[PDB]
RNA sequence: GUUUUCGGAACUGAGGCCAUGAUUAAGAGGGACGGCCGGGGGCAUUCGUAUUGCGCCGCUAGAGGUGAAAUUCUUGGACCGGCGCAAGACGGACCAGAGCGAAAGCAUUUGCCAAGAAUGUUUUCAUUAAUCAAGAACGAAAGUCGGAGGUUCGAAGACGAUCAGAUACCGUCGUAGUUCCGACCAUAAACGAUGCCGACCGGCGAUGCGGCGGCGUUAUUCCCAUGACCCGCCGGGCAGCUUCCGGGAAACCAAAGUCUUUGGGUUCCGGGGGGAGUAUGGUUGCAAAGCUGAAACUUAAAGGAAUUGACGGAAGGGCACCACC
RNA sequence: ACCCACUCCCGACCCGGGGAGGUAGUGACGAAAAAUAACAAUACAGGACUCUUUCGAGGCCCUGUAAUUGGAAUGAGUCCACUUUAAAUCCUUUAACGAGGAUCCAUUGGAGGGCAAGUCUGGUGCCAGCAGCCGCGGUAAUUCCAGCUCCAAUAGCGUAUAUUAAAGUUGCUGCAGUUAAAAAGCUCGUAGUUGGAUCUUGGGAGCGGCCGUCCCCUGCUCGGCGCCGGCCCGAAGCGUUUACUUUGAAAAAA
């Protein structure tokens, strides 16, 4: 069951049993990391990196090929973003909605969906403060939000 | 959401045996389910089972007789002294002649009758008869 | 039916079922040796691509994204590779 | 119970505590309003002084005249219509007599045919109304 | 006269050594991605009859209205017929036990705007979750305040009937209102009279959305590949039929089942009928009122489901010259 | 009311004082034991047996009821004495008296149902009254008022009121919420509550007849079963932190 919907969807990605790398994949773990760096430098998220990789370069899971996963490869060298991509995207969506709702006070549905998105943010913020990957001093305020692109 | 995985298991193999199934898939898996089942097996209530290893939590497939009248969880896992264990088997089993409260002691997950002779109480997991 | 071989699903039954609900979890995707006739190189494309996989040294654009499986452009062939 | 948490003692106790007030038998005993408005002030019996002898018309079905006695209670100064038991026992009650008065049986609820009379007369002038009815004691005048 | 090894504690530089350190990726959850999907919402634009009013032209005395009439209109030309014009409502038929939305709700065209479920995924984060005192958003209709507009309909009111009366049902007018804008109000039989999350336990053919597969027919004809049908499967949704799963007081419910064989998590909430959602205090509101909310007292029942009968100003069938033809 | 004799306390104190305390009196708060008759002979009746179709015979065997009769009983009371005790009392002991209507007299509530026990008789006539509730009472009242009778508990039994069980009608065990009372209009949301899977196992030592019951699978300052600075081991001190369970200490009597 979804967080802020009645939806009981089951559209999950389903990894195979065999964590063992396939045969055909000729790229060594280092050249995969080198290509991950090349994608990160272009300005892509670990989500967008992983998609571009498995599509055009036949690398199912970076964790399967290498040891580690894409953010931890970004983070080790310091190509990772300061605030997480998923909490970035909710703040990005909240600034989009709030801009729409500046000149559309009639749009009561928007206003309700804003409160649902605000709740997704506060909920993730609270999680990342327990894991100290955000400052304890940090708090998403909608007036301070437009600077956080 | 799913919170007591041992509840999902015992209710699913209870539902299944009431229906008359020869075996039943119980599609999350924990070490506590596996110890509980081995206790039900040692007293011959269920048949020799099978733990399917995916690389997540397992799935178990449990051969059934028609001996298991009911298995069940006690949630929450109440603490049971050796004093109190009479009052549980008094109100939670269908007789003194059969039925077994499983309770997780320090010694290990086991029936109430071994918790007597080992002289160790602990937390009631469930029961079966 | 009361008695079902729950441990031994016949492969007609397993491939029928939802990927998550299979006795062991198993995807419905696969990698393709997609080759265009204009170019020399065999590119590895993911079946459910969801991007525009291009010819590196542009002779064409190979696949186009849809709901499920991507459309392989007319002219292109595919072998499904496995381990 | 609808919260079987191991750490839920106060919710389960504090709910039960709150929902006991929706019981009648509890709400009655555990407020002053039932014990204050009680004409006897929570006592079993009560001596009062007859100020008139009163015929009360029985209920809808059956139809006699129930011979009760209007009483000024000593302790409170409160007004009570109290029934007089067996056949021809209103002949034993001179006016301005100190009568000992009990409940009727239903813990301050109206009994049988008698509308809003919760009390019976037990003794009259400190002589028992059963003893006068059986003729064992004679009325001291 | 000392500084030392020695013990013992701090600050700190290099090397080796550790198999050097990150469990998995939930038929939990968030987020990205993809092509869809929907009377989802907002802003604008656009259309369609119809209604009412107005003007013009025609011909004629009735028209409206009702069970029957009357009020009303009407030779100063009504109603009717034809061409236009204006305004404001409203979106027929298509329109479904169909869809979307948290609920209230949502239906001319087109554009913009952000939003959303579902499916697809060998993408990512990796327990972030479930439910929730406080606090909060939205919340039909009516109603309140200040504007704008006023076509229709129409609380109050004026009549005209019916009637014993008729401050009603019927009819003709008709103010507030109905419409739009800004601000309240926060309630409905706001209903599935059914809290939310999760697991399990029957069968069947349908339908809607996405995906995947399969003979054939048809279109873009010039192959493709996409639509339209066709035959299956998978997930998610609104449903339906059926069954001694089981439950239930039953009616009935694939949930209202998996409950004396009683324990998956959690919120709200009931305790005989009245008194009473009343009095009182607080609080919100301009108001109307809303939220919280007793007691005395009164009472042997009130009530639920089902059965049989009687009864109906309900439906259908049948008989009779004590009924008709 | 009597007393410091008991119990203890106070004092300079083996010696005085104590309405503290003790002893009687009142006492159906309540608790324990426990009389109100037992036994025979007769009429009688029911049940064993030879016997009879039925009646009837016998009672060797029983069992029950009649203000029938007959002695044998023992204490309620009366009461000398001792004992009791500070002095008495009560109790216990014990001379003498002390029972046939054993008048040395058992009540209290009931008898329609719940609920044990009259469809009896006389009275009343929706009156009087009964009746916890349902009900009874308007001329054959099973319910009122009485008589006889029967039932229940019994030296007790009824009544009013608080309170417990019955109440799974407060529900932790364990209730309910479509329609009987009941799910907030809907959603978000903080404390509260609940929260996925996963991190040690195989065998070494020994016994009984393949299965059972035991010991072992952390490391570095001080000495005793010993040895040519340390080997085996004994006693300290550091050792993820809690809940839990088992044991131990400790916890006034009544």
Swiss-Prot record, chain A:
One BP annotation, GO: translation
Modified sites of kind Phosphotyrosine: 37
GO CC list: cytosolic ribosome; cytosolic small ribosomal subunit; nucleolus
Location of cross-link Glycyl lysine isopeptide (Lys-Gly) (interchain with G-Cter in SUMO2): 42
SUPFAM superfamilies the UniProt entry points to: S15/NS1 RNA-binding domain
Record InterPro entries: Ribosomal_uS15, Ribosomal_uS15_arc_euk, Ribosomal_uS15_N, uS15_NS1_RNA-bd_sf
Principal localisation: cytoplasm
PTM info: Ubiquitinated at Lys-26 by RNF14 and RNF25 in response to ribosome collisions (ribosome stalling).
Modification Phosphoserine occurs at: 29
Entry keyword annotation includes Cytoplasm: yes
Residue positions where N6-succinyllysine is found in the record: 26, 33
List of residues that carry N6-acetyllysine: 26
Cellular location(s): Cytoplasm; Nucleus, Nucleolus
Key words, A-Z: Acetylation, Cytoplasm, Isopeptide bond, Nucleus, Phosphoprotein, Ribonucleoprotein, Ribosomal protein, Ubl conjugation
Location of cross-link Glycyl lysine isopeptide (Lys-Gly) (interchain with G-Cter in ubiquitin): 26
A single GO molecular function term of this UniProt record: small ribosomal subunit rRNA binding
HAMAP family in alphabetical order: Ribosomal_uS15_A (MF_01343_A)
Assembly mode: Component of the small ribosomal subunit. Part of the small subunit (SSU) processome, composed of more than 70 proteins and the RNA chaperone small nucleolar RNA (snoRNA) U3.
Family: Belongs to the universal ribosomal protein uS15 family.
Identification of the protein by name: Small ribosomal subunit protein uS15
Phylogenetic placement of the source organism: Eukaryota, Metazoa, Chordata, Craniata, Vertebrata
UniProtKB/Swiss-Prot annotation, chain B:
N6-succinyllysine: modified positions: 87
Entry protein name: Small ribosomal subunit protein uS8
Keywords from the named record: Cytoplasm, Nucleus, Ribonucleoprotein, Ribosomal protein
Domain of life: Eukaryota
GO biological process, one term: translation
Location in or out of the cell: Cytoplasm; Nucleus, Nucleolus
Assembly and binders: Component of the 40S ribosomal subunit. Part of the small subunit (SSU) processome, composed of more than 70 proteins and the RNA chaperone small nucleolar RNA (snoRNA) U3.
GO molecular function, one term: structural constituent of ribosome
Cited PANTHER family: 40S RIBOSOMAL PROTEIN S15A
Coiled coil stretches, renumbered: none
Lineage: Eukaryota, Metazoa, Chordata, Craniata, Vertebrata
Protein's job: Component of the small ribosomal subunit. Part of the small subunit (SSU) processome, first precursor of the small eukaryotic ribosomal subunit. During the assembly of the SSU processome in the nucleolus, many ribosome biogenesis factors, an RNA chaperone and ribosomal proteins associate with the nascent pre-rRNA and work in concert to generate RNA folding, modifications, rearrangements and cleavage as well as targeted degradation of pre-ribosomal RNA by the RNA exosome. Required for proper erythropoiesis.
InterPro entries the record matches: Ribosomal_uS8, Ribosomal_uS8_CS, Ribosomal_uS8_sf
Family per record: Belongs to the universal ribosomal protein uS8 family.
GO cellular component, as recorded: cytosolic ribosome; nucleolus; ribonucleoprotein complex
UniProtKB/Swiss-Prot annotation, chain C:
Gene name, Swiss-Prot/TrEMBL: RPS27
Residues recorded as bearing Phosphoserine in the entry: 10
C4-type Zn finger ranges: 36-58
Source taxonomy: Eukaryota, Metazoa, Chordata, Craniata, Vertebrata
Cofactor(s) this protein requires: Zn(2+)
Compositional bias per record (Basic and acidic residues), positions renumbered to this chain: 1-15
Alphabetized UniProt keyword annotations: Cytoplasm, Metal-binding, Nucleus, Phosphoprotein, Ribonucleoprotein, Ribosomal protein, Zinc, Zinc-finger
Protein's UniProt name: Small ribosomal subunit protein eS27
Domain of life per record: Eukaryota
Organism: Oryctolagus cuniculus (Rabbit)
Assembly notes: Component of the small ribosomal subunit. Part of the small subunit (SSU) processome, composed of more than 70 proteins and the RNA chaperone small nucleolar RNA (snoRNA) U3.
Cofactor comment: Binds 1 zinc ion per subunit.
Family: Belongs to the eukaryotic ribosomal protein eS27 family.
Keyword NADP: no
UniProtKB/Swiss-Prot annotation, chain D:
Modification sites for N6-succinyllysine: 53
PTM per Swiss-Prot/TrEMBL: Hydroxylation at Pro-61 affects translation termination efficiency.
Residues bearing PTM 3-hydroxyproline: 61
Modified residues (N6-acetyllysine): 134
GO molecular function, one term: structural constituent of ribosome
GO biological process entries: translation
Compartments it resides in: Cytoplasm, Cytosol; Cytoplasm; Rough endoplasmic reticulum; Nucleus, Nucleolus
Covalent cross-link site, Glycyl lysine isopeptide (Lys-Gly) (interchain with G-Cter in SUMO2): 36
InterPro entries, alphabetized: NA-bd_OB-fold (IPR012340), Ribosomal_uS12 (IPR006032), Ribosomal_uS12_euk/arc (IPR005680)
Chain's role: Component of the ribosome, a large ribonucleoprotein complex responsible for the synthesis of proteins in the cell. The small ribosomal subunit (SSU) binds messenger RNAs (mRNAs) and translates the encoded message by selecting cognate aminoacyl-transfer RNA (tRNA) molecules. The large subunit (LSU) contains the ribosomal catalytic site termed the peptidyl transferase center (PTC), which catalyzes the formation of peptide bonds, thereby polymerizing the amino acids delivered by tRNAs into a polypeptide chain.
Family: Belongs to the universal ribosomal protein uS12 family.
Subunit structure: Component of the 40S small ribosomal subunit. Part of the small subunit (SSU) processome, composed of more than 70 proteins and the RNA chaperone small nucleolar RNA (snoRNA) U3.
Name the UniProt record assigns to this protein: Small ribosomal subunit protein uS12
Species of provenance: Oryctolagus cuniculus
């Amino acid at each position: 069951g979804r967080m802020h919907a009645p939806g009981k969807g089951l559209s999950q990605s389903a990894l195979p049993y065999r964590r063992s790398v396939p045969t055909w994949l000729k790229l060594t773990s280092d050249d995969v990391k080198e290509q991950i760096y090349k994608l990160a430098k272009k300005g892509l998220t670990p989500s967008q990196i992983g998609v571009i990789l498995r599509d055009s370069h036949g690398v199912a899971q970076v964790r399967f090929v290498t040891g580690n996963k894409i953010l931890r490869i970004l983070k080790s060298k310091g190509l990772a973003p300061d605030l997480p991509e998923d909490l970035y995207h909710l703040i990005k969506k909240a600034v989009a909605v709030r801009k729409h709702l500046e000149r559309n006070r009639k749009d009561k549905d928007a206003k309700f969906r804003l409160i649902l998105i605000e709740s997704r943010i506060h909920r993730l913020a609270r999680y990342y403060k327990t894991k100290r990957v955000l400052p304890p001093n940090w708090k998403y305020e909608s007036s301070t939000a437009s600077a956080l692109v | 959401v799913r919170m007591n995985v041992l509840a999902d298991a015992l209710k699913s193999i209870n539902n299944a045996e009431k229906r008359g199934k020869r075996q039943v898939l119980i599609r999350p898996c924990s070490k506590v389910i596996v110890r509980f089942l081995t206790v039900m097996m040692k007293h011959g209530y269920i048949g020799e089972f099978e733990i399917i290893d995916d690389h997540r939590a397992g799935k178990i497939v449990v051969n059934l007789t028609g001996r298991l009248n009911k298995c069940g969880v006690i949630s929450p896992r109440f603490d049971v002294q050796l004093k109190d264990l009479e009052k549980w088997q008094n109100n939670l089993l269908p007789s003194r002649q059969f039925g077994f409260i499983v309770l997780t002691t320090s010694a290990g997950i086991m029936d109430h009758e071994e918790a007597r002779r080992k002289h160790t109480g602990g937390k009631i997991l469930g029961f079966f008869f | 039916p009361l008695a079902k071989d729950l441990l031994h699903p016949s492969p007609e039954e397993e491939k029928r079922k939802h990927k998550k609900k299979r006795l062991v979890q198993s995807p419905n995707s696969y990698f393709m040796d997609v080759k265009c006739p204009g170019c020399y190189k065999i590119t590895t494309v993911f079946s459910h691509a969801q991007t525009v996989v291009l010819c590196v040294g542009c002779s064409t654009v190979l696949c186009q994204p849809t709901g499920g499986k991507a459309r392989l452009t007319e002219g292109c062939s595919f072998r499904r590779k496995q381990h | 119970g609808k919260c079987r948490g191991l750490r839920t003692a106060r919710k389960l106790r504090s709910h039960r505590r709150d929902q006991k007030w929706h019981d009648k038998q509890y709400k009655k005993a555990h407020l002053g309003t039932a014990l204050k408005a009680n004409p006897f002030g929570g006592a079993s019996h009560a001596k009062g002084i007859v100020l008139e002898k009163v015929g009360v018309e029985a209920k809808q079905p059956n139809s006699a005249i129930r011979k009760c006695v209007r009483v000024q209670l000593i302790k409170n100064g409160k007004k009570i219509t109290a029934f007089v038991p067996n056949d021809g026992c209103l002949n034993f009650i001179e006016e301005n007599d100190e009568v000992l008065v009990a409940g009727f049986g239903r813990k301050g609820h109206a009994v049988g045919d008698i509308p809003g009379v919760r009390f019976k007369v037990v003794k009259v002038a400190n002589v028992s109304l059963l003893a006068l009815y059986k003729g064992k004691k004679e009325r001291p005048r």
